Design a protein around this ligand. Structure first.
Ligand SMILES: Nc1ncnc2c1ncn2[C@@H]1O[C@H](COP(=O)(O)OP(=O)(O)OP(=O)(O)O)[C@@H](O)[C@H]1O
Ligand SMILES: Nc1ncnc2c1ncn2[C@@H]1O[C@H](COP(=O)(O)OP(=O)(O)OP(=O)(O)O)[C@@H](O)[C@H]1O
Ligand SMILES: [Mg+2]
Ligand SMILES: [Mg+2]
Lengths: 523, 523, 523, 410
């Protein structure tokens, strides 16, 4: 309908207020000092998740302007959240600080573009500093510590992550499932993961993550793309009879014919998924073979001349469950044959040795590795189902963070890195004063999140911040200890990536907010 | 329903007020001095685009009269915006100044027709002056500068435009795509562009521009027009199975049979597009052949006796993506065959030499050129996806402006041309006094936009304007420098066309507004 | 009564609103092209005026808080007119300027105390600059030039002033009275003047000028503090029998019974005015003697056992006329004994010769100066009573302008001196940035008067200000002729004292108001 | 009290509305075909009138701002009638016209100060043009023609005016009184007139015309400023004993105790009127002498040690009648001593001969003109008291129209 438009400060104020409200709840929650937040649910009794984000998610602003402004922060934060796996709150906190200052500058009537530029400039510098600052992740003990951080003092989660990580291998993928019982169960499972996208978001399953999980999926592998439904159809009919969800692997699943029917026709009355077959060329075929063996299903190729229509259900393999995400598709456990799987691995392994070339070796080795690695499953127990779900969610979050953290390496947590970088940053200047202030603002923003933790502590963040800044190297404040010590030595480290991601996003948001002269809303 | 009608000044005032509101937001934004504007979105967090227009777009007036009046300006401005590629704001600014004065004249009770005539007369004179004034665009360095202007101090965009422009060639078309990653990628791609319209706006794709982009379009080329669906249909069915969007090239696509089904029946459940085959006569056929080779598809002709029905999907070529606009249709990249494409070019090239006649040579050379030129693709990276989109939009705008600017040649920016012309204009007189005042009004209007920039500077526009006027030749004020220098030497130049376009449209709008005695609204 | 209390920005917006009503009403009258202001009167037809002091006197607001803001600025600004004989409207314009931008900065989070320190510094330096810019006015030629300028270019008024000042000293006491005919008269007479105003404003007599004239009054000298009428009734009765008015010069009159009756009761039956004796301590007694001998009366001192109960008419002194105002009492023609007066002057002259300290000598000769100085009475003659009365007003005005001019010289009028000194102070800085914006706030405020003046001229104030600032020395804009030039040569100047008082008082309230955190008023 | 403040165009529309009500009400009566206006009265039945001045007098608006607009135009326009004896309605009509279009231009963004300068110029030139267009009215034939025209074509009224003016000068003082019968009477009498009106409007007597008539009043001449009643009570008592009204000609009467009591208290017990002495400075004193000798009274001057406390009735002068208005006092029949009056006129006549400057001579002869001029009294006779009263009004009107005509033509 008609839209109400505001411009200038008036627009800004609304956004600012909205931002603060969202930020405030988040800020307190963030940090181990803060307590877990529960989100009220209209649907049922509130769900308790240890997410800064969740608070934000719940929070809606009645005021459209404020709400919209609030929304902006959240969306960006989530984006950071996804990539980093953590630091949703941090970005939010950072954004708020930046925005407020930026707004003030706007109040000043300095030209905001420069501020943004300065902020961007500062951010870039900070990022560089952070990268240098970052130090490689420590051993599993560190990993547990990393896990704990994601845990927010969930020791078990960290332990589970470490334990799972050790057995599977850090590289090896770990999957989380609801626990059978109170006691957690860690079982290694056979399976392979190949990075393949899901053809359409439509395919994307119920859960919020958007990864699709199929229960007892049926796997059809075709080297050939499926041009038309019709050939596929007779396969589908059998599948339908089984009623088990169908997962399709094709070199390409032709979108409209299959997908249009699948999505529109198949609500989830039937379940279907499609993924591109991993790899390309012979390797792709080889990969398919590896997959096929693991599944225990068979693959049909034109070259073979096997017909999809001819192929029965039996040809299709089955998986205990499959999870698909945009980046990757994995099969948690193909039923497979134990002997069959092993034999294939050996055969591939032999091939790897056989090939003189590195290239051949690499492909083969990669192929074996996927099968060999298998998948690890973690069960989270809980006193109650509700708890288990909550725990599970936390565990999952911890796992992505840990995995990210290890690869990236760890940097001092507590926003120590942020503060540390800022000091260096301060020296750096912007082209013009307006830029300069923006740069300073960014630096100020970085400092803030450290303070917030301190505030939760109840210690005066000023002193802590000052002290922290004074210390060279990794100098930081440990909330739990409430003692000064090396962050690394303490072993409380925030992932470089997460920190970097959050900062950049927040800066982006802040810059955007500052720029936005005008807001428009519906009446 | 019932309409509320106003007449006379009362109508005028409403329009005027509405105009001012829209104008005011735009005016401030316009100019590098101004800051980028963000539009609030109900849908989601606000989108930041560097568009004067966007502010206008967002702005709606609650008052119907005001709103309608506001609307009038916007629509015209956009029209100017499209043609010029830039200067949306300028037109708006110009219009507002003109309208207000005109309204005042109306208040005066001078007969407004004459004013309009004078304004038109003044405009014409101004245009002539501008054309003479304009000086050919400078080299790529200038181009970058031109790009920067579109950039609004986006150095990268200007660089990208220049870089893309250099490689492709100014004449060569450049296409923009979202960046794969943060770093921009510029890749030359094979492809040909032929200026063909889209048969129906219905075909027009989702995006606002209305250019239709198809992903992996399938190309069917027929020399023959497709009389009826039926022959086409079997082709379509295959296409549907692929599910890949279908692009159709026909000498004429018979509108109702194909299009009625396509538009109505094919929502975008399937995607189809139709374009007329480029050229006519043998040349058209030749062009088709060139296209066909590039696509890698084949063309079916009655003369050949190949049947559309007979023709399979294979006959149809594929394109990585196709973009269509009303003026032109382009294929970003036909898969083509590298050898095949090259061979054809050579063959055509040989033909060009072979033909004695210029005419034959020209056609052949044109044909080769399209294939030879290929298309250039620019990827815009961004820290965040949102940024990338914003950046991309800016880039696109810059590119049209730059392209337009180069051909037209550049004139001093800063509204220097406008002010300069006006002084000359002032001497010119109108038939009658009422006309005279209108002429003066137009001149006044031209001056204003210079002032606005100055105002953003905070320098008193009066002095600047006076100073600017005093200087002969290209004398202007550089906002960034805040120093007086030659506009050309400064290298900050606004395209002649954009300036001309904006002025004319604004004048048209202003004239229309002045004339409009009465407004009517719904109750 | 229950109060309504406001803090911070809430009290801020309130005061700003009250100040803007007062300032905007008063400033329309500023400059040669000042507009009129209509002040309603229940007494009959409205009054159309351009006297900014009259307008201010009528300003009272409904909102208790806003009214507090207005009454504050009115009280301080009035002190300027009292001190320099002019400056109130300029003081109001400046005050509004400093307060407007000051509070903006405060609301921007800047430190109120710092802001005030900066404002205060700029004013200190600026006053120094005005002192430097001042053109002296000492020689009789200068005195006359200033006089005629003030008397609207009346050579005769300038002559009168110069003649009077020459015949009684530049710092001598000069009065203006009605003429006895066509010719002007000037005669020094036995009189005196001391800085002591009326005890009650309710003593104001016919002179609308806020003064009190008493023809042939009886001077009552009592160094006692009269709080009760009882011991004074006999005197009052005797005075009443004489029908002559009375002037009570006592140590102090307390509003218990005396000042109570003298005002509340004597509203027509008698004409009684009361003032405090000059000085304090022993000097108070000595001075009363001087006044006593001068008026031929005797002082009633309890020390000598003098009883007011027995104070007969012979004890009371007398003078041809006495004029008392806010802070001054002037005894125009003492009926003292020439020889007695000469005797005292000699007696004190001797005391000076045998003085043992600078302080003694100074005060001693200040007393002889008063007695031996006399009063210069100007009798304004004319052809008609109307002319006589009008000229008399001009003489009174020119006299107060010239006296201010002899004291601190003269400076470029038209709001040019303030904008001049301000352009010099562009490099001035303070202990910190807040203090710096404080300095800028004051400098920008110094341009308000000229810009207002030019505004009433229908001209562009930012253009004229920009031009005047770019000039040097007493170069400015003559709003009368609307041409630039040398303000002093163009005869457009103000006594440096009024420009100074205006700025200082303006900065005073502006400072207090900017450092006010809470407002209390009745509900 | 808390105020309501308006600026620019807001104050503009307000004043324009108040002016339009006033002007539109008053202008309906303009011309020979002017319409009537009904003015309500609580006193009884409404008054139907065509007198635009009466209508204006009743105009007061509810909106404080609009009322300010109306009261402004009413105050200035009234000055026209006071000055020329007519012009108020025309002044209102013109004012409304100039203000209507003026404010339109102002609202159109034109400079108010410039607009006013232009208006002022056109008026300067136009007044010059009117002066050129003017047909003189000096000869007795002309005087009579204008007189009868003003008296609704009454040849007798024109004759009266012309006769009076001839017998006392065109700029001489002429009064109109009730006749003693059928025949008109005209007789020059010892009198004088000076430009000084009543101090308080509350002194208005029976004459609804905004004037005050006093039969056989006692003239009190005091060059002092009387602010308190104390030192005047004895005189007032004596005057009261005489039952005759009183005219106080002083330097100025201050509203502290004197003007206060003289008005607020003397609302029926006595008939007292007060006016300022003519001129200023030394001339003020001289003129008071002229008035003194003329009325046969003496001036109380503090300079001579004169005390109002001892001012007896013999000090007070007397006249057959005295008429005071907004800005004029006319002493119709001074009980002065013929020879004394002639003596003064001669004394001043001598002073003129030995004058040493134009200014002295001028003012000196202005004084002898007043004393030696006398007052021409017209007695309007008729067949019935009604006719007499109606004709008298016509004579008063025609007299004021003719005097204006002799001064600047027609
Ligand atoms: N004992 C500790 N001392 C210092 N800081 C700590 C300590 N333990 C954790 N932190 C810090 O607290 C922050 C992690 O908390 P949290 O995960 O709530 O923040 P977040 O990741 O931004 O919010 P969310 O997880 O909701 O996105 C990190 O900066 C982390 O280093
Ligand atoms: N440094 C500069 N000095 C002078 N003017 C400048 C400078 N850089 C750009 N400009 C001017 O600013 C204007 C371009 O800004 P902008 O693109 O916002 O205006 P617009 O094209 O009318 O608005 P929109 O792009 O929203 O349609 C041109 O007149 C351009 O010459
Ligand atoms: Mg976290
Ligand atoms: Mg542009």
């Amino acid at each position: 309908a008609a839209k109400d438009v505001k411009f200038g400060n008036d627009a800004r104020v609304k956004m600012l207020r909205g931002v603060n409200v969202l930020a405030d709840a988040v800020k307190v929650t963030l940090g181990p000092k803060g307590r877990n937040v529960v989100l009220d649910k209209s649907f049922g009794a509130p769900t308790i998740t240890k997410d800064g984000v969740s608070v934000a998610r719940e929070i809606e602003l009645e005021d459209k302007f404020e709400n919209m402004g609030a929304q902006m922060v959240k969306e960006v934060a989530s984006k950071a959240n996804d990539a980093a796996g953590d630091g949703t709150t941090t970005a939010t906190v950072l954004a708020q600080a930046i925005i407020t200052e930026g707004l003030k500058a706007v109040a000043a009537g300095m030209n905001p573009m420069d501020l943004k530029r300065g902020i961007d400039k500062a951010v870039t510098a900070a990022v560089e500093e952070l990268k240098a600052l970052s130090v490689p992740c420590s051993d599993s003990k560190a990993i547990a510590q990393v896990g704990t951080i994601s845990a927010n003092s969930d020791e078990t989660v960290g332990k589970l992550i470490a334990e799972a990580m050790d057995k599977v291998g850090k590289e090896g993928v770990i999957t989380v499932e609801d626990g059978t019982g109170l006691q957690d169960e860690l079982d290694v499972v056979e399976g392979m993961q190949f990075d393949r996208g899901y053809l359409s978001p439509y395919f994307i399953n119920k859960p919020e993550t958007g990864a699709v999980e199929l229960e007892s999926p049926f796997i059809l592998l075709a080297d050939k793309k499926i041009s038309n439904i019709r050939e596929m159809l007779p396969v589908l009919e059998a599948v339908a009879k089984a009623g088990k969800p169908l997962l399709i692997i094709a070199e390409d699943v032709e979108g409209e014919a299959l997908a249009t029917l699948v999505v529109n026709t198949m609500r989830g009355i039937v379940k279907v998924a499609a993924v591109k077959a991993p790899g390309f060329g012979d390797r792709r075929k080889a990969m398919l073979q590896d997959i096929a063996t693991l599944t225990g299903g068979t693959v049909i190729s034109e070259e073979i001349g096997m017909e999809l229509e001819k192929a029965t259900l039996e040809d299709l393999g089955q998986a205990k469950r499959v999870v698909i995400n945009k980046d990757t598709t994995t099969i948690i456990d193909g039923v497979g044959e134990e002997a069959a799987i092993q034999g294939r691995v050996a055969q591939i392994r032999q091939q790897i040795e056989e090939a003189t070339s590195d290239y051949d070796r690499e492909k083969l080795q990669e192929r074996v590795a996927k099968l060999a690695g298998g998948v690890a499953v973690i069960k989270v127990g809980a006193a109650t189902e509700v708890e288990m779900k909550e725990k599970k969610a936390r565990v999952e979050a911890a796992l992505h963070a840990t995995r990210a953290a290890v690869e990236e390496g760890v940097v001092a947590g507590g926003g120590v890195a942020l503060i540390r970088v800022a000091s260096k940053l301060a020296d750096l200047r912007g082209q013009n004063e307006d830029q300069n202030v923006g740069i300073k603002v960014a630096l100020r923003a970085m400092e803030a999140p450290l303070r917030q933790i301190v505030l939760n502590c109840g210690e005066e963040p000023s002193v802590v911040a000052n002290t922290v800044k004074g210390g060279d190297g990794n100098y930081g404040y440990n909330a739990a200890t409430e003692e000064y010590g090396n962050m690394i030595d303490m072993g409380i480290l925030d992932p470089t990536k997460v920190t970097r991601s959050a900062l950049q996003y927040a800066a982006s948001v802040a810059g955007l907010m500052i720029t936005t002269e005008c807001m428009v809303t519906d009446l």
